Structures are given as C-alpha cells and as structure tokens.
Design a protein around this ligand. Structure first.
Ligand code: 5GP
Ligand code: GMP
Ligand code: ZN
Ligand code: ZN
Lengths: 199, 193
C-alpha cells in the first residue's frame, strides 16, 4: 500500500539520493512532495517504534522524542540550516532561520512509518496542492515536537481536515475556499519575510 | 506615579547602567525585577508612540511593530544572545537560545511607557514572586510580537500550569517555583555545548 512508501528509506537509506543523512538509528530524508520550500522528514529506524502512532510516541515514548530532538538540535542542526539556505537563500543566517522552521508530527499521518517533519514556515511549494495539506501543517493537527503532554490533541484523520475560511498563518487574512488566492498570498508573505530577513 | 518610571530610560539612556543599547529610536534595558533569568525591555523613544496602548500598537502601528522586530532579529540579536549567555550559561549557542526566548507585550501593561519584553522561557528568578507575575507571561495575556492582528484582544484565577510540560499545581505557587527550577536544570543540561 502507499502507506508503506516510506519504509524503503529506513530499510536501505544508502540507496536513495534524497536521504541526506543516516546512521543505525535514524534517517533524514527530503520529502519528495515538499509542502514548504524546505521539507525534511526525520525517521526512526527502530522496527518496534516505526509503526507506533506519533501521539503514542509523544505520550509513552519520551526517550525517542528526546533522541529525535537531540539530532535536530545537535548532529543534524548544521545540515538542516544548510538545506534551508539551499532551499530558500544562502544569505540567511542560522539566526534568521531558527525562527522560520517548525518541527512536528501529524496527528493523523497518511504514512505508516513514523516521520517527524522539519520544515520552513512559508508553505510556498508547487507540491502544496490542496488546502487539506495546508491545514495539516497550520492547525493543531500539526503536533509540534515540544507540545506539553497535557496538551496533545486527539488522533486525527487527514481527510477530515476542512476549513470554510482558509487563513494565512502569518497575518490571519482569510480567503474563503479560494486556495489559489491563498497560495498567491503565501508567496507574497514569503517575499516579504525574505526581504526583511536576508543579510 | 511610579507607573511612569520607565520614562527615564528613553529620556536619558546614557545615565542608567542597566541600559545595554540605545540609539535615537529605541532603548534596550534590563528589567529591574526580572521574571526569567534573562529579561529585557525594548522601548520606543518616540514621544508619540510611548504612550500608545500596546494592543493599539499591534493593531494600528505595524510600522513600529516591524521596526521592533527588525531590531530584535537584526542589529540587537547578538547583544540579546550575549546577555542570555551572561544570565544563563556561557556554554549556550545562539541556536540553543533562539528557541528559548519569547518576545511580546502584556495585553494590559503594568507601566505607562511602551515596552516590549524579551526574555528567556525559564521563569526561574527571585523576582518572580506571585502567580500573577507568572500567568502574565505564560497565558494569552502575553501577546507575542508575531501574533496575527486577527487574533488580538481589546484568567489569573485558574490553576498554575508548567509552561513546558503542562503539569498543574493548583494555586500552589511555591511548588510551581521549585518545579520551574527542575525544568530549567533539565533544559540546560540538554542544551549546553
Ligand atoms: N528597568 C526597570 N524595570 C522596571 C522598573 N519598574 C518596573 N520595571 C519592570 O517593568 C515591567 C513592566 O511590564 P508590564 O507588566 O508593564 O508589561 C515589569 O517586568 C517590571 O519588573 C524600573 O524602574 N526599571
Ligand atoms: N520522500 C518521500 N516522501 C513521501 C513519499 N510519499 C509521501 N511522501 C511525503 O511524506 C510525508 C508524509 O506525511 C508527506 O509530506 C508526503 O509528501 C515518498 O515516496 N518519498
Ligand atoms: Zn498573510
Ligand atoms: Zn514542567
């Protein structure tokens, strides 16, 4: 099934050119359908954890949460910032980018193998093709990795994401059901952020 | 009244040892009663903006909002990280600190001259002495500077909640205090180089 598509990256990371880091424990892979300018997935290779729902990981497997966060903040940090510079602009410092990257799980992932999203905020991407994808990263369905355990949402359903009034994550302007207009506005917001942020 | 006391920093910043930056437009000053390990205030010197309510600034003075943000992320960012290192640990990188600093206005300001808080998340401080102090920085009363304008208002009653893990302590302020210290030690241990 398509839900098992990510398994190949944790079975044979050495074989896939969009895997930009691996070791015995984790794989860092570029999303092939990126939903922001930079969109990476950090995957555990542990066969006993990969099929655990991310909300069960956040509640009951804090050892893994801490290990994943230690990779994002530690050994992989320079790699992630360099990928953002490649995806956005080389003139962005780590300091500019830190505030423009989010890290989290979906409350209802479409793929079966556990994957932590590491992505820029912009949501400017040709692969962002419908508003359910947008909502899945800009609502509580996106469970940030530092969410207090008391605050975790319910297990979700990607296909039930729907908003009658689509909303810009940065300024709050709304667009009804007109996703095309929202995308054009996200491009303007990105242009503005970039102008204000480059060195 | 004493509520006008921050005015001295924007009138005569050269005169006060807790001012760590000034220019014609802004002053960056240490909070005298810090509510986290690092707690700074960034103040406009503009006499026509200093007395404007912070929610009116957020709604109607986006020019000033963008200017404050540009100072905080731009020209003052190294001073801010250096201050954080002086207050927390010299072993902390800018990258570790950037996720541990919040920037915002109180929705109901306690002083009359406009002041943007720039502070670490810990709330470990001898000057944090009651529940109102804590809740005013960890609840929607603290209006982050990146809040969308669609989300702005025109509470302190509820149970104390750790901002980091969400554990609650009822109205037991002293238990919250000890817990914040444990949370800070834990963050620090994982964050130092
Ligand atoms: N540097 C300085 N800070 C002050 C003085 N008086 C009060 N403060 C700080 O000013 C802040 C005002 O925050 P507010 O609640 O008004 O948004 C408080 O955190 C308080 O500790 C003072 O004379 N000098
Ligand atoms: N790299 C990669 N990403 C995928 C594949 N199938 C789905 N995705 C992405 O994986 C994520 C799962 O939520 C989404 O962001 C998808 O765009 C695939 O075969 N390879
Ligand atoms: Zn917008
Ligand atoms: Zn806690």
């Amino acid at each position: 099934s398509f839900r098992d598509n990510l398994k190949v990256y944790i079975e044979s990371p050495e074989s896939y050119k969009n895997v930009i880091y691996y070791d015995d424990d984790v794989v860092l892979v570029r999303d092939m359908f990126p939903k922001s300018k930079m969109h990476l997935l950090l995957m555990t290779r542990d066969p006993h954890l990969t099929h655990v729902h991310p909300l069960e990981i956040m509640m009951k497997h804090r050892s893994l949460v801490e290990k994943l966060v230690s990779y994002v903040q530690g050994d992989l940090s320079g790699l992630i910032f360099d990928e953002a510079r490649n995806c956005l602009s080389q003139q962005l410092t780590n300091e500019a980018l830190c505030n423009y990257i989010k890290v989290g799980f979906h409350a209802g992932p479409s793929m079966n193998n556990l994957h932590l999203h590491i992505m820029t905020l912009d949501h400017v991407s040709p692969s962002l093709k419908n508003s359910a994808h947008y909502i899945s990263f800009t609502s509580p369905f996106f469970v940030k990795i530092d969410t207090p355990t008391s605050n975790l949402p319910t297990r979700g359903t990607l296909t039930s994401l729907f908003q009658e009034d689509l909303k810009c994550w940065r300024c709050g302007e709304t667009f009804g059901r007109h996703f095309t207009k929202l995308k054009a506005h996200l491009q303007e917001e990105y242009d503005d952020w970039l102008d204000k942020s480059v060195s």
